[PDB]
Structures are given as C-alpha cells and as structure tokens.
C-alpha cells in the first residue's frame, strides 16, 4: 500500500535464505542446497552424504 | 490518525477525464478528484 517498503535485496546476506526456517548465518550454498550447517548434519544420510573417511 | 469526519448525504458537474463515474469537489477556485487520486486544477 505504502510506496517505499523495500531495499535492493538481490545480493549479499539479507536476500539469501535457507529452505527450513530462514537463518542469515552459516548458509551452505554449494551445489544449490540452501540448508544451514546445523540442519545439514541432521539430514546428511537422507540426501546421500556419508562419513567414509 | 483520524475518524475521517464521517457525514452522509453530501448534500455539481461530472468528471472530464472519466465518464459518468466521479463528481468534482468545490473550493475557492480549487478542484480535485476522488477515485483517480487527485488530478484537477482549473474550474469545471
């Protein structure tokens, strides 16, 4: 409704986000995952990652 | 903020730009619309 209600958020840390909740810190963007490093340890083997060595 | 100074039955010429849609507002040689935000200057 109001005119000014945004910023150029097409880059940096504020615009980027995870899939689960939306944390702006500790973000894995490798291979287009977008799941933060706390939840990645929980969901490693379901995706297919394993601790071989 | 405000209650809008509500008062029904109020109480004139139609719009030049639009069709039979909105009426003009009478002031001391000053005019502006309602729906099309506010786009008048000269008297009509």
């Amino acid at each position: 409704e109001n005119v000014w209600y945004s910023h150029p958020r097409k880059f940096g840390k504020g615009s980027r986000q995870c899939r689960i909740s939306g944390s702006h810190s500790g973000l894995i963007r490798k291979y287009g995952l977008n799941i933060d490093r706390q939840s990645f340890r929980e969901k490693a083997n379901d995706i297919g990652f394993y601790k071989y060595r | 903020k405000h209650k809008k100074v509500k008062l029904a039955v109020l109480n004139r010429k139609e719009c030049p730009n639009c069709g039979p849609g909105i009426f003009l507002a009478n002031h001391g040689d000053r005019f502006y619309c309602g729906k099309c935000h506010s786009t008048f200057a000269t008297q009509k």
Binding site: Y5, R19, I20, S21 | -
Partner: protein
C-alpha cells in the same frame, strides 16, 4: 483483514475447484501464484477459516498447506450458492 470483498470470494472460488492450497510464507509479495491476489491477502483469509471449524493446516518448510474438512465444503456452498454434485476433492472427476 482489510480486504475489499471482491478479492476474498476469489479465494473461496479457487479452493472449491481443486480442493488444495499450498501458500508460501513470504509476506510483502506483489501477487500470489495461480490466483490473482496478494500473499498477505491469501494467508489471512485461510487464517480466519481455522478459527470457526476447519481447516487442516501446517507451518512446515515455509509452506502453509490447507485442505478442507467435510463441514468446510458445506460452509462454502452457502456463500458461493452451488447446491450439490460439485468439484471439491472428496471424490475423483472420473478415472484418476
């Protein structure tokens, strides 16, 4: 909640044909996907539904889900005025 009532009846419309709504959590968006209304307009409409009977919903992975109960189908028939033998998703269209 401050929604001109032309837009609110279009949310009941689109719910009744398909029987499912998958609304994103993103507020301050130009318009919703598929349906031609705002995201804040759509979420608050289905938010008001949950209080007065219905609707089966979640808050998971930034995706609000909404699927109507049996009494919820009867409520929507009153406003939109459709009598009986209609769309929803209790029974299939034909072979599916």
């Amino acid at each position: 909640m401050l929604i001109p009532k032309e837009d609110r009846k279009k949310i009941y419309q689109h719910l009744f044909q398909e029987g499912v709504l998958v609304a994103k959590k993103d507020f301050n968006q130009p318009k919703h996907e598929e349906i031609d209304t705002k995201n804040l307009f759509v979420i608050k409409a289905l938010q008001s539904l949950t209080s007065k009977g219905f609707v089966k919903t979640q808050f998971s992975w930034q995706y609000y889900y909404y699927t109507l109960t049996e009494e919820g189908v009867v409520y929507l028939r009153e406003y939109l005025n459709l009598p009986e033998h209609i769309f929803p998703a209790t029974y299939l269209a034909g072979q599916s």
